[PDB]
Amino acid sequence: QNFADYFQNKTLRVDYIFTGDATQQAIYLDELSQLPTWAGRQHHLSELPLEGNGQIIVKDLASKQCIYQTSFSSLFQEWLSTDEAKETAKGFENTFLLPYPKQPVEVEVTLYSPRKKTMATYKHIVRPDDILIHKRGVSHITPHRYMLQSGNEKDCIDVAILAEGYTEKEMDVFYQDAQRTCESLFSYEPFRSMKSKFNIVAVASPSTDSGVSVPRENQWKQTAVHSHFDTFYSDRYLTTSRVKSVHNALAGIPYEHIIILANTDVYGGGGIYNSYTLTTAHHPMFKPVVVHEFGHSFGGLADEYFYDNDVMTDTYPLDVEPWEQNISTRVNFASKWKDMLPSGAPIPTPIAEKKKYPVGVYEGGGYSAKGIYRPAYDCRMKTNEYPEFCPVCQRAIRRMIEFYVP
Amino acid sequence: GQNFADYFQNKTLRVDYIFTGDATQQAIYLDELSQLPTWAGRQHHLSELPLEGNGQIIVKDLASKQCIYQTSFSSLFQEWLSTDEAKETAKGFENTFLLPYPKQPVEVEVTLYSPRKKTMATYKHIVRPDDILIHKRGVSHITPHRYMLQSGNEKDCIDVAILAEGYTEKEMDVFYQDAQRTCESLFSYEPFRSMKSKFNIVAVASPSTDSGVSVPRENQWKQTAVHSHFDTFYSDRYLTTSRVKSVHNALAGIPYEHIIILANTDVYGGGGIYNSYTLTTAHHPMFKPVVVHEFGHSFGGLADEYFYDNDVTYPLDVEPWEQNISTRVNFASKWKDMLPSGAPIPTPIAEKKKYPVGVYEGGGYSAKGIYRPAYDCRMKTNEYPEFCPVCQRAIRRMIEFYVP
Ligand SMILES: [Cl-]
Ligand SMILES: [Cl-]
Ligand SMILES: [Cl-]
Ligand SMILES: [K+]
Ligand SMILES: [K+]
Ligand SMILES: [Zn+2]
Ligand SMILES: [Zn+2]
Ligand SMILES: [Zn+2]
Ligand SMILES: [Zn+2]
């Protein structure tokens, strides 16, 4: 499929509202926007690199031929397993980028459960001549600086680093934090060997207040992307549900993936597949932590630690193969790293034999000590203190990069 | 009588919802709870309504289920539901409401009604006042503002906020001149003129990055304080904002009950919706009568009395909840008590001098089956000098309801 067959070199941005509670879910359209260029895929348009927990399928309206596919996970889907979702139905902002069509399209959004069951589905027609498609990124483009520029937006993976909780007086600190992000990311394989496949842009989005909101301390701050601690009443969980403010700050700058830096030294943050990474820039463990989160948001990798996470409730049924590439329930292991496991390797791999098996079937991962397996004894997806991604995480990241750019 | 201090604090519980749906189904969801440092609303008549509206919010004490606060409204969402787009694409709309801040947990219930008074959507949620995720607002960086009229405190007076849309920081002297023109226009009309001491008027200089407002059909997308735009529902001159949270965020920390948004342009356009806002163009030649007509909707909850249909409401077998129009289904609930004995129904146009209060056929966008109280009114035309006697009574009732 040639890009120019159905698409223009512009972006069709779609803002949705993901709604529901523990019993029901529904999707609604908020607004359509246009970005002046298309920073995404030129190839593999009608395929997915990963299933994700959510998908967007674009079909040509006249023929119903599938012409674009993208997958993701969302903060909304984490919220659905919290105590609040049992009693109060809520709406969540969710933004996705699609190539701008030459002709009318049918856009279909689907949300899936941890058992791969359809939770909610939504179909809408987009007509490219619609005057209410909000044009963006043509004026007041946020001041920005390229930290790494390997090539144009068509040939490279565009990553945007966005300032959260930095006033105009603190932008030199932010740009230094963006340099540190770039230096940390490209110190890890396969990012290190595939550095020429990436563009890194630092976006100096100003905040009225220095720092970020801490609701439990009654510290409400006015910031660029309105992030806050106490997400789902988990003290150190720093997130933003103001996704439109994130994408509005980035309009006009080519971007595919987002890293949000919060101007604080306390611990916290997280990353979600094709959502964003958000972490505290001045915490001592920033360098390995931002890369662990990018493992989720860009790599779509799972946590390999087997201790319970606060915001992650009943995430992996043991009778279902996870869609994440670096963990397995041994339901469909041949779809995972069976092809990288040496002949005659014991399953599970005994921990005493870890030096013999850099690639094994180690019991424990995805927040469970039993029934879930990880590919190595340790990895950056397991601990912040281990030096690198395990070989299976590295292959998965190489596949993500090869999928997105030739 | 219900004392304010029995259930409430002198603070505001602001609730932001998402109103969702299409022509076949509707649903309401919570977005976020906020707190404002004072309560600018009613101190009396807490558990009653001045009008039915098309939507209601009922606040009940959680433990007893006793009704402790009621407010009614209409919404941009409910207008959108009758458009072509609502037949094919389900959408979500921002809707913000202000409630008195409770001392103890409450049950908040939102209900949306159809033009036939049928329940379209209902939503119940519990608010616990010690919830740390209630977003505190209006405590820092309060938008620069100026009192155009200050008759008294926020408890005793009706607080009206005038907000700047499409004015850069360099144009705030023009905006303050426009807010002053708004106040001068409003208080030139009865009963506002004789009840001037019941109001506070505050001009809020919310800065815009760009001068003017967005015109989608001209591909003119501007970055402004409340993100208003023309071409609402593909109606060229329909100027609105669906970014209701941005309106209320700019006003956080300033006492307000009703909102007037002034757009920095001289072209024609705007509108007002009951307990939503008024939004109009400040420099159009007909500004003075137009802003008051819109305030008739947004504050008065009055209907349009003109019989011609807009570019884009009242079933003839249903009595409208609006006080200045009737389908004569329940005419005794309207201005029957002001109609002289033996007045002809309908009142012939040739006999308009004999009947300042009649039953004139035509109103609420229909030439037949809907009736208005006078041949002409501010709610019918921009060129007529005043509100009709029935609109004036209805406005007096609104003011008397809100403040002693
Ligand atoms: Cl800000
Ligand atoms: Cl994820
Ligand atoms: Cl109305
Ligand atoms: K790219
Ligand atoms: K008041
Ligand atoms: Zn993680
Ligand atoms: Zn790994
Ligand atoms: Zn009107
Ligand atoms: Zn009238």
XYZ file of N, CA and C in Angstrom, chain A residues 17 19-20 24 26-31 84 87-93 122-125 127 130-136 138-140 208-209 213 215-216 218 220-222 228-233 242 244, chain B residues 16 18 20-21 25 27-32 85 88-94 123-126 131-137 139-141 209-210 214 216-217 219 221-223 229-234 243 245:
300
model
N -13.712 10.791 23.875
C -14.009 10.671 25.294
C -14.262 9.188 25.524
N -15.615 6.582 28.099
C -16.489 6.677 29.268
C -16.884 5.335 29.836
N -17.291 5.348 31.091
C -17.841 4.162 31.704
C -17.548 3.983 33.163
N -19.921 -1.092 32.422
C -20.154 -0.685 31.030
C -19.156 0.352 30.565
N -18.263 3.084 26.933
C -18.723 3.702 25.694
C -17.718 4.764 25.221
N -17.625 4.975 23.899
C -16.713 5.945 23.280
C -17.553 6.999 22.542
N -17.127 8.256 22.618
C -17.804 9.357 21.942
C -16.767 10.249 21.305
N -17.118 10.899 20.210
C -16.211 11.852 19.579
C -16.256 13.191 20.319
N -15.096 13.824 20.497
C -15.017 15.165 21.048
C -14.831 16.131 19.874
N -13.649 16.096 19.212
C -13.347 17.005 18.093
C -12.273 16.439 17.163
N -13.110 3.512 42.609
C -13.994 4.579 42.130
C -14.876 4.122 40.939
N -18.389 2.651 41.543
C -19.496 3.498 41.995
C -19.785 4.728 41.127
N -18.781 5.260 40.384
C -18.961 6.514 39.647
C -18.517 6.395 38.193
N -19.466 6.562 37.235
C -19.153 6.525 35.795
C -18.470 7.845 35.371
N -17.332 7.741 34.700
C -16.549 8.923 34.323
C -16.148 8.921 32.862
N -15.704 10.084 32.377
C -15.209 10.288 31.021
C -13.734 10.687 31.021
N -12.963 10.136 30.083
C -11.523 10.360 29.964
C -11.145 10.840 28.579
N -10.259 11.856 28.501
C -9.739 12.382 27.226
C -8.749 11.424 26.623
N -16.742 1.970 18.542
C -17.292 3.238 18.057
C -16.885 3.454 16.613
N -17.851 3.723 15.724
C -17.593 4.015 14.313
C -18.056 5.429 13.979
N -17.230 6.185 13.236
C -17.618 7.527 12.762
C -17.015 7.796 11.382
N -17.707 8.621 10.600
C -17.271 9.011 9.265
C -16.592 10.371 9.368
N -15.087 13.350 6.900
C -15.073 13.885 5.536
C -14.007 14.984 5.520
N -14.788 18.774 5.756
C -15.532 19.249 6.912
C -14.830 20.484 7.501
N -15.509 21.646 7.449
C -14.977 22.929 7.929
C -14.771 22.908 9.451
N -15.415 21.978 10.190
C -15.239 21.958 11.649
C -14.048 21.071 12.099
N -13.234 20.618 11.132
C -11.963 19.961 11.460
C -11.046 21.131 11.872
N -10.726 21.211 13.166
C -9.965 22.305 13.775
C -8.507 22.345 13.286
N -8.138 23.377 12.507
C -6.750 23.472 12.045
C -5.845 23.936 13.182
N -4.754 23.203 13.388
C -3.787 23.456 14.454
C -2.363 23.433 13.925
N -0.337 25.901 13.074
C -0.042 26.860 12.000
C 0.433 28.213 12.573
N 0.168 28.467 13.837
C 0.550 29.690 14.544
C 0.893 29.372 15.985
N 1.675 30.246 16.650
C 2.086 30.097 18.057
C 2.647 28.698 18.347
N 2.491 28.133 34.544
C 2.299 29.314 35.397
C 3.063 29.121 36.726
N 2.941 27.915 37.301
C 3.605 27.532 38.541
C 4.737 26.556 38.315
N 1.068 19.454 40.774
C 0.029 19.337 41.789
C 0.198 18.077 42.632
N -2.373 16.684 45.199
C -3.692 16.816 45.872
C -3.705 16.477 47.375
N -2.993 15.427 47.832
C -3.035 15.039 49.263
C -2.414 16.122 50.180
N -2.791 19.268 49.428
C -3.630 20.396 49.045
C -2.764 21.405 48.262
N -2.374 22.517 44.740
C -2.896 22.534 43.382
C -2.190 23.637 42.611
N -1.462 23.238 41.584
C -0.668 24.149 40.763
C -1.231 24.271 39.372
N -0.990 25.418 38.750
C -1.405 25.697 37.387
C -0.196 25.417 36.481
N -0.797 15.603 38.064
C -0.970 15.561 39.519
C -0.557 14.222 40.081
N -0.141 14.224 41.342
C 0.116 12.999 42.084
C -1.249 12.483 42.575
N -1.270 11.405 43.398
C -2.506 10.846 43.979
C -3.477 10.332 42.909
N -2.966 9.952 41.713
C -3.821 9.376 40.668
C -4.408 8.080 41.228
N -5.766 7.930 41.181
C -6.499 6.755 41.724
C -6.221 6.567 43.220
N -5.875 7.672 43.918
C -5.542 7.726 45.346
C -4.273 6.903 45.657
N -5.410 15.288 31.142
C -5.592 16.421 30.232
C -4.759 16.195 28.974
N -5.635 16.376 25.796
C -5.732 17.411 24.749
C -4.700 18.523 24.978
N -17.939 19.432 36.836
C -17.795 19.382 35.398
C -18.237 18.009 34.941
N -19.655 15.518 31.402
C -19.643 15.295 29.969
C -21.059 14.827 29.628
N -23.276 13.263 26.812
C -22.974 12.475 25.614
C -24.213 11.924 24.937
N -24.056 11.590 23.671
C -25.108 10.910 22.950
C -25.249 11.276 21.504
N -29.914 8.071 21.765
C -29.540 7.805 23.163
C -28.703 8.921 23.761
N -26.388 10.035 27.607
C -25.771 9.587 28.861
C -24.915 10.713 29.448
N -24.784 10.746 30.770
C -24.008 11.758 31.499
C -22.886 11.059 32.265
N -21.707 11.676 32.292
C -20.554 11.140 33.019
C -19.875 12.252 33.765
N -19.257 11.940 34.884
C -18.503 12.941 35.634
C -17.126 13.161 34.993
N -16.682 14.425 34.920
C -15.332 14.737 34.482
C -14.483 14.984 35.745
N -14.748 16.091 36.473
C -13.974 16.472 37.655
C -14.770 17.380 38.596
N -25.852 16.187 12.318
C -24.699 15.450 12.829
C -25.092 14.450 13.934
N -26.026 10.786 13.039
C -25.009 9.857 12.559
C -23.785 9.699 13.475
N -23.439 10.716 14.301
C -22.212 10.670 15.107
C -22.463 11.011 16.576
N -22.200 10.050 17.498
C -22.364 10.273 18.944
C -21.197 11.112 19.484
N -21.511 12.179 20.214
C -20.487 13.099 20.708
C -20.624 13.393 22.188
N -19.565 13.966 22.767
C -19.510 14.398 24.164
C -19.332 15.904 24.265
N -20.029 16.531 25.227
C -20.048 17.987 25.446
C -19.720 18.348 26.875
N -18.872 19.378 27.081
C -18.531 19.906 28.423
C -19.693 20.699 29.005
N -28.211 10.806 35.948
C -26.900 10.432 36.490
C -26.832 10.775 37.953
N -26.462 9.800 38.807
C -26.305 10.012 40.248
C -24.857 9.755 40.666
N -24.294 10.640 41.496
C -22.945 10.461 42.038
C -22.864 11.010 43.452
N -22.008 10.376 44.270
C -21.774 10.788 45.650
C -20.527 11.679 45.666
N -12.781 14.546 49.946
C -12.134 13.918 48.801
C -10.979 14.816 48.324
N -9.724 14.303 48.418
C -8.514 15.072 48.044
C -8.485 15.364 46.550
N -9.263 14.635 45.711
C -9.229 14.922 44.265
C -10.269 15.980 43.849
N -10.897 16.657 44.853
C -11.711 17.836 44.548
C -10.667 18.939 44.258
N -10.583 19.383 43.005
C -9.573 20.338 42.530
C -9.798 21.744 43.103
N -8.897 22.218 43.974
C -9.058 23.566 44.531
C -8.667 24.599 43.495
N -9.566 25.581 43.298
C -9.388 26.642 42.319
C -9.677 28.012 42.947
N -7.622 30.335 44.125
C -6.820 30.685 45.311
C -5.540 31.429 44.914
N -5.119 31.282 43.661
C -3.925 31.934 43.138
C -4.148 32.332 41.684
N -3.366 33.309 41.196
C -3.404 33.845 39.829
C -4.861 34.150 39.373
N -4.529 34.995 23.217
C -3.267 35.037 22.465
C -3.490 35.846 21.181
N -4.609 35.568 20.483
C -4.985 36.253 19.246
C -6.147 37.216 19.456
N -12.420 32.719 16.208
C -12.301 31.732 15.135
C -13.509 31.748 14.194
N -14.313 29.160 11.384
C -13.946 27.927 10.653
C -14.153 27.961 9.130
N -15.270 28.535 8.625
C -15.527 28.546 7.176
C -14.480 29.369 6.389
N -11.380 29.448 7.385
C -10.173 28.756 7.812
C -9.352 29.677 8.720
N -8.565 30.003 12.361
C -8.576 29.391 13.681
C -7.646 30.170 14.590
N -8.223 30.792 15.609
C -7.505 31.655 16.532
C -7.386 31.020 17.903
N -6.330 31.395 18.634
C -6.108 30.944 19.999
C -6.633 32.045 20.926
N -16.121 30.102 18.462
C -16.039 30.015 17.009
C -17.382 30.242 16.366
N -17.364 30.733 15.142
C -18.557 30.851 14.331
C -18.828 29.450 13.728
N -19.816 29.319 12.812
C -20.134 28.055 12.121
C -20.550 26.921 13.080
N -21.096 27.269 14.262
C -21.600 26.257 15.207
C -22.756 25.527 14.510
N -22.703 24.171 14.442
C -23.705 23.305 13.776
C -23.837 23.662 12.284
N -22.741 24.206 11.700
C -22.627 24.651 10.308
C -23.613 25.809 10.016
N -16.161 24.957 25.025
C -15.073 24.886 26.001
C -15.501 25.588 27.289
N -15.389 24.546 30.410
C -14.423 24.520 31.519
C -13.482 25.737 31.452
